């Protein structure tokens, strides 16, 4: 079913109805006028960040190249393969860019310290896929450019998601959400979920340990805030 959308909810309403019970929600009217929303474009990103080295996930492999090279090879025209500048602390690397975002006020409801919040960039073409997995902190995923299809499964449903059987990968599902092998993973079919298309200016709250799967529908840039 669709993730609820709420316009600028109070801190206490967000706390009581979403944060404490661990329920996803999309926050509207919160990040929609951050400077990134109007400023970020391929040209702006090239100008500010083009010469800097970033990690890129290809396919599968992991490599390093400049932001300019990433755009040239994996974003524009007709890329050979899907590449994704995923899960990278770009704003620590480039303080000028950090000026264009801010910490959501709702993070103050956490028990953690503000300067321990991990801020990651997720920048890539249409068609990037982050397979179903769970993270160990709360997340506000802020959509800046393009749209993402997102599927969410509660931690209560872990038994239907067939986690990998190693410590390193136990927070990742073995299932391909959008084309599941139901002969091998029959329990997956029945597991309930939420989904949404997250659009520019919207923030998705992904509760701590909620399983999430993410596919970019367009050229996309998201910023995640991992907080406690
Ligand atoms: O945006 C993506 O492709 C995936 N994002 C996450 O898993 C996250 O923000 O924790
Ligand atoms: Co994640």
UniProtKB/Swiss-Prot annotation:
Question: What cofactor(s) does the depicted protein rely on?
Answer: Fe(2+)
Q: Which reaction does it catalyse?
A: L-arginyl-[protein] + 2-oxoglutarate + O2 = (3R)-3-hydroxy-L-arginyl-[protein] + succinate + CO2
Compartment(s) of residence:
Nucleus; Chromosome
Give the tissue specificity.
Weakly expressed in most cells. Highly expressed in breast cancer cells. Expressed in embryonic stem cells.
Q: Which UniProt keywords apply?
A: Aminopeptidase, Biological rhythms, Cell cycle, Chromatin regulator, Chromosome, Dioxygenase, Hydrolase, Iron, Metal-binding, Nucleus, Oxidoreductase, Protease, Transcription, Transcription regulation
Co-factor note (free text): Binds 1 Fe(2+) ion per subunit.
Q: Which residues form the JmjC domain?
A: 83-228
Membrane-spanning residues where? Answer: none
Q: What are its GO cellular component terms? A: chromosome; cytosol; nucleoplasm; nucleus
List the GO biological process terms. Answer: circadian regulation of gene expression; fibroblast proliferation; G2/M transition of mitotic cell cycle; in utero embryonic development; negative regulation of DNA-templated transcription; positive regulation of DNA-templated transcription; protein destabilization; proteolysis
- Subunit record text: Can form homodimers (via JmjC domain). Found in a complex with RCCD1. Interacts (via N-terminus) with RCCD1 (via N-terminus); this interaction stimulates H3K36me3 and H3K36me2 demethylation. Interacts (via JmjC domain) with H3C1. Interacts with FBXL3 and PSMD2. Interacts with CRY1 in a FBXL3-dependent manner.
Protein name as it appears in the record: Bifunctional peptidase and arginyl-hydroxylase JMJD5
Q: What is the lineage of its organism?
A: Eukaryota, Metazoa, Chordata, Craniata, Vertebrata
Residues included from the entire protein: 183 to 416 of 416
């Amino acid at each position: 079913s669709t993730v609820p959308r709420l316009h600028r909810p109070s801190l206490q309403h967000f706390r009581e109805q979403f944060l404490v019970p661990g329920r996803p929600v999309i926050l509207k009217g919160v990040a929609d006028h951050w400077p990134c929303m109007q400023k970020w474009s391929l040209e702006y990103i090239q100008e500010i960040a083009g010469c800097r080295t970033v990690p890129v996930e290809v396919g599968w492999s992991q490599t390093l190249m400049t932001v300019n090279e990433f755009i040239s090879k994996y974003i524009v025209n007709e890329p050979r393969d899907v590449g994704y500048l995923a899960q990278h602390q770009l704003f620590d690397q480039i303080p000028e860019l950090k000026q264009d975002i801010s910490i959501p006020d709702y993070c103050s409801l956490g028990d953690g310290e503000e300067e321990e919040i991990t801020i990651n960039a997720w920048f890539g073409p249409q068609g990037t896929i982050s397979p179903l997995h769970q993270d160990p902190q709360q997340n506000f995923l802020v959509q800046v450019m393009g749209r993402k299809y997102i599927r969410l499964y509660s931690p209560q449903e872990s038994g239907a998601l067939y986690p990998h059987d190693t410590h390193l990968l136990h927070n990742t599902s073995q299932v391909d959400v959008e084309n599941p092998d139901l002969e091998k993973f029959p329990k997956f079919a029945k597991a309930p979920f939420l989904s949404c298309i997250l659009s520019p200016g919207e923030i998705l709250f992904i509760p701590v340990k909620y399983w999430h799967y993410v596919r970019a529908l367009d050229l996309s840039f998201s910023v995640s805030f991992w907080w406690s």
